[PDB]
Amino acid sequence: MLVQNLIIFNIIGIVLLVLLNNNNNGILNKKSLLTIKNELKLKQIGLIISIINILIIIENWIGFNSNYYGFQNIERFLNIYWGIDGISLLLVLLTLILGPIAILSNWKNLKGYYTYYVISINMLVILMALNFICLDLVSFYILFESTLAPLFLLIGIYGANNKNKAAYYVLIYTLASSLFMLLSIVIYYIIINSTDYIYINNIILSINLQSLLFIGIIIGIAVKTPLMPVHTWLPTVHSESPLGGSILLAGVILKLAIYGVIRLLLPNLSEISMMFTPIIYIISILTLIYSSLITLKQTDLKVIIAYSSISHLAVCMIGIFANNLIGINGSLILCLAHGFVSPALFILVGGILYDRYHNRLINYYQGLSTFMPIFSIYLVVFSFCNTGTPLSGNFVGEFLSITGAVIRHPIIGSLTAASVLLSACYQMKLTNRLTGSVFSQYLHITNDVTNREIFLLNWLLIPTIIIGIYPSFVTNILNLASSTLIYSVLI
Amino acid sequence: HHIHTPSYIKPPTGGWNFTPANWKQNTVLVLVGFTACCVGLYKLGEAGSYNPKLKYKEEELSRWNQSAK
Amino acid sequence: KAVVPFSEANKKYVSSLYRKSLRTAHDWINKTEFYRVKASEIRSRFDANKHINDPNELKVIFKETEALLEDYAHPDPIIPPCRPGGSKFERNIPPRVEARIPIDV
Amino acid sequence: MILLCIFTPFLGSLISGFFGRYIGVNSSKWIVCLSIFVSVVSTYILFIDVIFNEIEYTYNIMNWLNVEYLVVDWSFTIDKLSVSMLVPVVTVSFLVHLYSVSYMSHDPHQQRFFSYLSMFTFAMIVLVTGDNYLILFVGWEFIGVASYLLISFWFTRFNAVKSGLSALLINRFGDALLVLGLSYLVLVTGSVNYNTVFALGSYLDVNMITVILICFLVASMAKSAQLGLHSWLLLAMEGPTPVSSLLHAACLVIAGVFLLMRSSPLLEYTPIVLLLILWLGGLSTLISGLIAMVSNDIKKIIALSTMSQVGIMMIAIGVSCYNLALFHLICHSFFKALLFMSAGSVIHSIISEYQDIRMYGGFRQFIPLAYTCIFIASLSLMAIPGLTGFYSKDIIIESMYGEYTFSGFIIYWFALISATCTSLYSIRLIYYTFLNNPNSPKYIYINLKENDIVLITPMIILTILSIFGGYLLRDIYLGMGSPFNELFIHPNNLSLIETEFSLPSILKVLPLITGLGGGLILLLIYEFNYSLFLVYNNKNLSKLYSFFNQKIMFDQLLNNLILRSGLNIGWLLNVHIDRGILQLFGPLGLWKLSTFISSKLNKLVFLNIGFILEIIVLSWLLIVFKVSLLKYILLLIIFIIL
Amino acid sequence: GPHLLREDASFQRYGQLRDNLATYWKFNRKAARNVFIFLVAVPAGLGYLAYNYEGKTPFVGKRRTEPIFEQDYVPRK
Ligand SMILES: CCCCCCCCCCCCCCCCCC(=O)OC[C@H](COP(=O)(O)OCCN)OC(=O)CCCCCCCCCCCCCCCCC
Ligand SMILES: CCCCCCCCCCCC(=O)OC[C@H](COP(=O)(O)OCC[N+](C)(C)C)OC(=O)CCCCCCCCCCC
Ligand SMILES: CCCCCCCCCCCC(=O)OC[C@H](COP(=O)(O)OCC[N+](C)(C)C)OC(=O)CCCCCCCCCCC
Ligand SMILES: CCCCCCCCCCCC(=O)OC[C@H](COP(=O)(O)OCC[N+](C)(C)C)OC(=O)CCCCCCCCCCC
């Protein structure tokens, strides 16, 4: 009853937040108790609900078996079958946790319309969570494009100076591309008469028809996760989007493409994936190398982190397309690890510095460790986590993905090791500059990190380290599920 | 000497020659804690450590190959 | 600019030219008794052109003069530690004094 | 007694890091020194049991990776080789900690310096105690993180903030290759455990073995500051003197050699790598000894001294004499740590706090204790017979001729030049600072005194170990037939017999004869005939001096031609790709095309009966034309858009 | 609120330019040389290693079938 509880609760919650606020429009001036203290009584309801959704998945977690093969909790709601397996459990779990942190990140840095902002965040979180627990290509697409409606309006209403430029980019790049995925989903519905996962996993298609389907789906994936040369939308969006939007966008939305490879490519187009795997490596490795050199010559603060997320999402794609359990498990752990470190960086860069000094030019800031020591501590730690330090969860993902590539292709997959060096250059050059030399002359001394901003960083750091030190909390769940995607015949 | 603004800058390490008024009071309060931790390390260390050259005798290994031969 | 002999502006330029003329020779020769000779030799070379009122020969000698200081320049000049370029430069610079400005973030 | 030896510095590092504000400054330095002291004692207890009573320890904490066949555990074994690395690291680091209490007494940030300094010690202990190659990598990375903080400790100094980044990034280049090597270990063998991997060395292919160890070699070049990646070594002087007294003696610098020694079971069956290791050492020893003779900074000279002395450990590896290199590593951790501390006391003693050796002179009478420590260290560094340097340095050079190969012979002269150069710049450093006419202002000398007892205690302890320690520890490592199977020496590579028997008498004294003769000849020229050493006369000797003084121009070639070029590639992608073609084939390009086409279309919508009449009549031609001509009309229709 | 960042006029022109380089980009014969290298030389450059060696590298436990060390020493004399 997971999905039935999940959708109904939020739909009930949305109506509750709609009723309480919009009842006072009327003809009367807004002298109301609810809007007192920046709608504090309507933000708290929204923050409670995002916490509750985490409790819904936990109720179905304790029943989850880590040893049974296939989809579990199979339920039919809205004439759609919903199931949870090893991979879908951790991505749903990660998605819901980023719910409260997205709301709490913009708790006191909006000019108004907090009720609209809260409902928009929850709808993005639930639709993302529901996307991992569907059981057909059509339903995968519906929850893969429904997020555009709140995401397009969230960026435009609550954006930066260039929000108009970015609002188009997120709407059109993710629609002019995902449509090319609608063609391939439709072809399955014509020649097989169903888009159900289990039905289409067992059907082999001709050598040509797999290529036509692979291209149509890889186009909608190579755009959703920014892969060169169609990566030119995320940096603009990340610069302009609000802190809640940036946290969800690089935290969950870009991981849908990694999960999209698991559902839409590996099982049902298994043969053609082996044919495309050398091509993916050339595209991915050049994405890793270019997106790390491009980051060196950047200036904008939030754009710098935006290109950093691209590099660590190229490592995921390199690992997932490896045909071994080592590559696949590490690619999934890295997505989980990158689901906390990347949102954390946007809190430091675009959620603490920007919320005080209101600028995003790297030339102003330097030597912030002189009067902001606590900010530097989390700046250095989240910088070393983002670079692949062994005690972090990024390293476990980055080691296994690099090792997984070498097993598949020892020659070109060796270039995947460039992420070890390149991630250190552009990242520390930001951390070295932000915490080096005399305190900048352009910045007045202000408040240090507050309790709210400390809380987010501490609860985005701990999961990263826990996975890094002891990733068997994650590997054990995935080991059965990840072993199904592998395609090989040994004689 | 000079003024270094230690009034609001409160890092975990103090900074700029910082020494609290009750530094003697907390000094032993850490020695008591630290000494207990080392005792824990010696109790944990000896209980769990082992010699990897003595777990399996030579006779047992000399037959493992005959099984795998 | 226009080298005007005996002017104050030319006095400073010779003052700068002589200041670098001894420092550069000081770096190559680290024994004082040998360094004293070199300063006298250069001082015995700033007297040959001391009485010259012809601008035409002044530029050519001034062009040569910089070339000599540029040729014999020491790749590793001696710098005082706390002066810029030394070893203690900007070491533990005292923090800038400015009142904190609280903000509601 | 194992778990106490490893994690005690970590506990001390955290206490000052977070509780440091609550426990003052002076009470925070001594607790950190207390935590290290526990580890020093525990190491000797292990050393007694491991080397002498042949007992090994292993504490397996919990599993780390369990992805199919690849299993990696958070385990820390302590075997003979591991303890032989704990003796240099843990003992010196305590002395560096003991030295830093009175060296950093005036620094405003003392609760933070000892937090990273001990964290460095723990990061090294994990490196030399992991029982699988991945745990080694956890320690290996955290030398760089600890060094990056310590080298850029004074973060308000521009030359020191940039120097930390240079030391962090070049090591990551080494760590980039180490990761790649670790992957090929999982590919070929299926695990990264020392036991599993080393047991297969004789059954694995040479090419697969060569590929892994070439990656280890590139990783080691960064850490041991060998040729091609040695720019960071001299740039690391921007940190405090205790940092240089610890990094360059029994720490980050030596960590390259330990990795290659640990891989002896794999390194043996690839002769090609052992050739590359040998040749890197000879060039690095030759080049560093030449650069050190014309440098004019007290810490640069000693820093270049380590690179030459680390290179001596590399050539000892290249002849498959791993026992010699390990023994010389332990010795060098004492007569090179002592040099930095004593040099760090010369700079402290003078009230102008100069570091250029050209502003010193005639200090022998004023600070005779600091001179005596340097002089004993310098003779040991020069391998004078009877001292620790003789029992370790000479035998490595003895065996360069002792292999009797072409490559072995060439490196012998490179060693022999550096063996003499070591005797030449050592005299230069002491003469320029203790036997020369005064250069500093006379006001300094009437205040030029010695330091307190805390700063003196470590130097005396290291002074004794710089005389006797090499003799006492020789037979453990360099003995004939001593059981040291932790380091594998293939039976065809045992050339220790020929080295100690077939060398003529001349070779056994030649480094000393040129060392003693060359030093005295230079000593006379410096004193009575100093007119020769003004190199500004002979343009050939001025260009030569300005060449080695700039360190073979490698700093200029790295900065101006690789980093400057490397950054420009990132600029080209940013301009011609990211903001270039992908913007023409994107929002900016498509706005032009849409504006062009939509401009043509809006002209067509205009109320006119004649206009709409012609198009209706025109469309009747579609019915008339044979439908094979649709593509032409489509081509024509696009033409009219223009 | 209190304008804690002392905005520099020339910094803004710098950031404004660095965010609008694509407007002034012109596809000359030099931008065409860099586009070709980065998009058709290198991708095809790794397009041959990724296929000339794909399925040609059986490295898992590749055993040794060849002696390493010389057996008979011939002096140069
Ligand atoms: C930054 C904010 C602070 C928050 C983060 C702080 C860092 C996190 C520190 C703790 C990390 C979480 C991991 C601890 C949970 C215990 C993991 C575990 O389950 O151990 C498994 C171990 C063997 O597995 P098994 O035989 O299956 O038995 C378990 C069945 N339930 O079963 C056991 O016997 C339990 C063994 C427990 C061992 C104690 C834990 C030691 C952790 C510290 C050492 C970490 C490893 C060394 C790394 C140090 C650097 C080298
Ligand atoms: C998970 C399943 C969810 C399904 C139910 C969705 C309910 C939508 C809300 C209806 C009520 C409403 O339109 O109300 C408007 C609300 C609340 O406005 P406010 O800021 O409180 O108004 C305050 C006005 N003052 C200030 C004058 C007092 O804002 C929204 O529009 C947010 C939610 C919808 C945005 C995007 C809609 C497009 C959806 C496309 C397909 C997914
Ligand atoms: C094996 C892994 C072990 C990890 C644990 C290590 C424990 C040490 C922590 C001490 C922190 C500390 O001291 O940070 C806090 C101190 C406080 O300033 P201060 O230097 O005391 O001077 C105070 C005067 N101000 C205010 C002018 C600075 O520094 C700083 O804000 C400096 C900024 C960089 C901090 C980098 C911290 C990196 C932590 C480790 C990253 C992986
Ligand atoms: C096959 C790979 C598919 C990849 C995704 C598709 C390409 C991305 C295009 C995004 C453009 C965008 O976002 O439109 C934004 C742009 C311009 O931006 P602006 O806001 O006016 O800023 C610029 C402001 N100036 C110009 C005033 C300075 O508007 C347009 O030109 C509107 C027309 C868009 C055409 C979309 C056609 C899609 C075709 C896709 C199949 C080939």
Chains that touch A (3 or more CB pairs under 8 A): B, C, D, E
Determine whether A189 is exposed, middle or buried from the number of CB atoms within 10 Å of its CB (0-12, 13-18, 19+).
middle
Residues of chain B found within 8 Å of residue C95, distances taken between Cβ atoms: 4-5, 16
CB atoms within 10 A of CB A452: 12
CA distance B60 to chain D (A): 18
The partner residues of D67 in beta bridges, in order of sequence, read D70
Residue D592, amino acid: K
**Contact call for C100 and B8, based on CB within 8 A:** yes
Residue in chain C closest to D535 (alpha carbons) equals C28
Helix (H, G, I), strand (E, B) or coil at A83: strand
- Rounding to the nearest 10 degrees, give the CA dihedral for residues D120, D126, D129, D133: -120
Counting ligand 4 atoms within 8 A of each CB, the residue from D591, D593, D596, D598 with the most, and so the one to mutate, is: D591
Question: Is the pair A, D in contact (3+ CB pairs within 8 Å)?
Answer: yes
Tell me which residue of D344, D338, D417 sits closest to D380, measured CA to CA. D338
Residue A399, amino acid: F
Backbone angles phi, psi at D152, to 5 degrees: -95, 35
Ligand 3 neighbour A394 (Cβ under 6 A): no
E24 — contact with chain D (CB < 8 Å)? no
Tell me which residue of D141, D573, D103, D563 sits closest to D348, measured CA to CA. D103
Sequence-separated contacts (24+) of A161-167 with Cβ below 8 Å: A161/A240, A162/A236, A162/A239, A162/A240, A162/E19, A163/A240, A163/A241, A165/A236, A165/A240, A165/D587, A166/A236, A166/A237, A166/A239, A166/A240, A166/A241, A167/A240
CA distance A252 to chain C (A): 26
**Chain E interface disruption, residue of C96, C98, C101, C104, most E CBs within 10 A:** C101
Ligand 4 neighbour D590 (Cβ under 6 A): yes
Tell me which residue of A115, A393, A121 sits closest to A244, measured CA to CA. A121
Distance D329 CA to ligand 1 centre (A): 35
Cα(D135)–Cα(A469) distance, rounded to whole angstroms? 11
Cα(D451)–Cα(D346) distance, rounded to whole angstroms? 9
What is the gyration radius of the CA atoms in chain A, in angstroms?
22
The residues in D 255-294 lying below 8 A from E, measured between CB atoms, are: 269, 271
For tokens 């973030």, what's the residue? Answer: C105
List Cα–Cα distances, A395 to A296, A384, A417, C70, D388, in angstroms: 22, 10, 12, 51, 42
Query: HSE of A82 in the Cβ direction (CA atoms, 13 Å)?
Result: 21
Cα(D365)–Cα(D141) distance, rounded to whole angstroms? 45
CA distance A150 to chain C (A): 26
Task: Give me the count of residues in chain A.
Answer: 491
CA distance E12 to chain C (A): 24
What is the gyration radius of the CA atoms in chain B, in angstroms?
27
Q: Which atom of ligand 2 is nearest to the CA of A122?
A: 1
Please report which helix (H) or strand (E) contains residue C41, including its range.
helix C32-43
Cα(D141)–Cα(D75) distance, rounded to whole angstroms? 17
**Sign, Cα dihedral of D49, D52, D55, D57:** positive
Which chain C residues have any C-beta within 8 angstroms of a chain E C-beta?
101, 103-104
D187 — contact with chain E (CB < 8 Å)? yes
Query: HSE of D165 in the Cβ direction (CA atoms, 13 Å)?
Result: 22
Residues of chain A found within 8 Å of residue B8, distances taken between Cβ atoms: 448
DSSP structure string for B44-59:
HHHHH-B-TTTSS-HH
Helix (H, G, I), strand (E, B) or coil at D450: coil
Resolution at which this structure was determined, Å: 3.8
Answer whether D258's CB lies under 8 Å from D85's CB. yes
Answer whether A43's CB lies under 8 Å from A118's CB. yes
Residues of chain A found within 8 Å of residue E19, distances taken between Cβ atoms: 162, 299-300
Cα(A448)–Cα(D569) distance, rounded to whole angstroms? 38
Residues of chain C found within 8 Å of residue A445, distances taken between Cβ atoms: 98-101
Chains that touch D (3 or more CB pairs under 8 A): A, B, C, E
Counting ligand 3 atoms within 8 A of each CB, the residue from D21, D112, D120, D129 with the most, and so the one to mutate, is: D112
Query: HSE of A28 in the Cβ direction (CA atoms, 13 Å)?
Result: 6
SS3 content of chain B, % helix, strand, coil (to 5): 55, 0, 45
D543 — contact with chain E (CB < 8 Å)? no
Residue A81, amino acid: Y
Q: Cβ neighbours of residue D277 under 8 Å, at least 6 residues apart? A: D217, D260, D314, D315, D317, D318
Answer whether A332's CB lies under 8 Å from A489's CB. no
- Region of D553 (left: φ > 0; alpha: ψ -120 to 50; beta: rest) is left
Q: Which atom of ligand 3 is nearest to the CA of B9?
A: 26
Answer whether D293's CB lies under 8 Å from D425's CB. yes
List Cα–Cα distances, D533 to C24, C31, D72, D423, in angstroms: 16, 11, 60, 18
Sequence-separated contacts (24+) of C16-22 with Cβ below 8 Å: C17/C65, C17/C69, C18/C42, C18/C46, C20/C69, C21/C46, C21/C69
Distance A147 CA to ligand 4 centre (A): 20
Residues contacting ligand 2 via CB (< 6 Å): A 7, 10-11, 14, 18, 21-22, 25, 113, 115-116, 119-120, 123, 126, 146, 149-150, 153
Residue in chain A closest to E61 (alpha carbons) equals A407
CB atoms within 10 A of CB A59: 11
**Contact call for E64 and D576, based on CB within 8 A:** no
Tokens representing D46 are 């292990």
Which chain B residues have any C-beta within 8 angstroms of a chain A C-beta?
5, 8-9, 11-12, 15
Residues of chain D found within 8 Å of residue B41, distances taken between Cβ atoms: 3-4, 7-8, 11
For tokens 């001299």, what's the residue? Answer: D234
**Contact call for D59 and B45, based on CB within 8 A:** yes
For chain E, the distance separating the N- and C-terminal CA atoms, rounded to the nearest angstrom, is 90
Answer whether D133's CB lies under 8 Å from D65's CB. no
D199 — contact with chain E (CB < 8 Å)? no
The shortest CB-CB distance from D21 to any of B4, B14, B34 is to B14
Cα(D128)–Cα(D9) distance, rounded to whole angstroms? 14
CB atoms within 10 A of CB A121: 27
Question: Is the pair E, A in contact (3+ CB pairs within 8 Å)?
Answer: yes
D190 — contact with chain E (CB < 8 Å)? yes
Residues of chain A found within 8 Å of residue B12, distances taken between Cβ atoms: 373, 377
Closest ligand to the CA of D73: 1
Tell me which residue of D236, D29, D251, D303 sits closest to D120, measured CA to CA. D251
